[PDB]
């Protein structure tokens, strides 16, 4: 049975045009929405969102397809996955809200979601944060032997189904918690909650839900490349006022310097690192939370 | 059991100091050694050693670790699976037969070990061929975003031990029967015979083959990426005169030119497509028995 991480927010199913998406809620003042990535769920925000919900109404979505977010049905093209559309489908289930205007944080696949989002939609945005990211266009230019080493499973998980989907019904405990371990400072669980990990566990348990996780990193490796191709080559940039925060010993790191690389892609950027591997909300949740607290307030 | 796919030829059992390499022995004349790669067995030579042994004495050997040759235990730098010592070894187990000078032919792995031969030990060769490869370095160098995603199996079989063990081991005849067909001109399995896909697919079962697998490519992502940067940054090239095959649809040819490649590494190179995938001398016996035949005899 799984914990409840967020004692006194409420859960929301939101209603939007390609499905459900969960969300837990709580706080008051300027609405805050917070996206996870890869392979977790809302829950990786248990111990951020307390904090910033003491100065926000805080929105932690479960991205469409994850989670407990129903999952539409994907296509040739993994359209419902890319970020464009995962973007398109968190505006409209802000909007059943009435929150037209917020500010947004995204991790990992959220905060891919997130910056696409303040590409196509900016007067969506009042601020953005993204953690330990750069754009995805980035990722696959700094394509090299270090790199495809690092992040093989941009590669791997984008191969046509069912291969990505066979091997990691192999042993879906074992990935799930390496992917976990290998990306943290210390290499191992300990950083985790036990209760969140069992949340990402038991997603990553559905077959269903390993298929979407895939899509998605098809969809990371085609059309999200694409869409953001086209914005390079236009020189369009992100014209919201942005947070990008990376770990030290984080992914973001390992491509390039990442607020040098953000300040090609966005008009008005802060940076800063933390100490930290990936997982910033769950490894240094304080340090990631004052430092989305200064910059949202 | 398995179907013996050479008729006519022997078993020889070859004590090398890092353990027996198995291999089928035929022919009559100049010595000629045939190296499989990944994920088969020497078997894949089923169809072109016949015609080879009408004028070479053939050995095909399985690789260190890989067939029925032991599995030496491997170590933090994976290195009896890297192509340096598979080679010394290989030249050991020729040795032991009495060939200090053999021509040798090697696919994809074997290919590997055998360019890698050449470069150390060039005194030991007469001529070489490489079958559809470019050297590990310069698929490494080439790795963008296109060719990630087409060989994304060079990176995902590099991550430490377990996890593509682990990930491998829960249903071993998919991943196996998948990249035998995936890299196929047809994408199916039309192009082998069945006798020898069992061969293959019973060799892939054994999880401490997957695993010696994983170690020879973790050798490739590492030792072996680093012995050919030295190669290459310091401009030495093989002295012996060799033969590049590719497959028209194959994997060396999406990354580059083979040939131009090749040129950069090899004093006397001489190449040619053949309409094929990745696996020549099962999709393509016949054509590639041929250009084999004629480069060894000439
Ligand atoms: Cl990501
Ligand atoms: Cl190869």
Redesign the pocket.
């Given at each position: 049975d799984l914990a409840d991480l967020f004692p006194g927010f409420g859960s929301e199913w939101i209603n939007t045009s390609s499905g459900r998406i969960f969300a837990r809620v709580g706080g008051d003042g300027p609405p805050l929405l917070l996206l996870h990535?890869?392979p977790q769920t809302h829950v990786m925000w248990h111990r951020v969102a307390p904090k910033l919900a003491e100065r926000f109404k805080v929105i932690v979505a479960d991205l469409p397809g994850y989670g407990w977010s129903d999952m539409p049905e994907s296509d040739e093209q993994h359209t419902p996955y890319t970020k464009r559309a995962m973007a398109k489908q968190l505006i409209e289930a802000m909007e059943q809200l009435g929150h037209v205007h917020f500010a947004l944080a995204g991790h990992?696949?959220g905060?891919?979601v997130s910056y696409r989002l303040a590409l196509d939609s900016p007067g969506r945005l009042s601020k953005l944060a993204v953690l330990d990211?750069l754009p995805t266009y980035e990722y696959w230019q700094r394509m090299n032997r270090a790199y495809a080493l690092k992040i093989y499973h941009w590669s791997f998980l984008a191969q046509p189904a069912p291969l990505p989907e066979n091997l990691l019904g192999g042993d879906p405990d074992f990935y799930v918690k390496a992917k976990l371990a290998s990306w943290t400072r210390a290499g191992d669980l300990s950083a985790f909650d036990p209760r969140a990990v069992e949340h990402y566990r038991i997603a990553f348990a559905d077959p269903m839900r390993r298929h979407v996780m895939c899509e998605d990193y098809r969809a990371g490796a085609y059309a999200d490349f694409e869409h953001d191709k086209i914005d390079v080559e236009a020189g369009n940039k992100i014209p919201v006022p942005m947070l990008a925060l990376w770990g030290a010993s984080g992914?973001a790191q390992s491509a390039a310097t990442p607020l040098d690389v953000w300040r090609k892609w966005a008009s008005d950027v802060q940076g800063a690192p933390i100490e930290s591997g990936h997982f910033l909300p769950e490894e240094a949740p304080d340090q990631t939370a004052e430092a989305l607290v200064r910059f949202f307030s």
């Open positions: 990535g890869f990992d696949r905060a891919r990211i992914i």
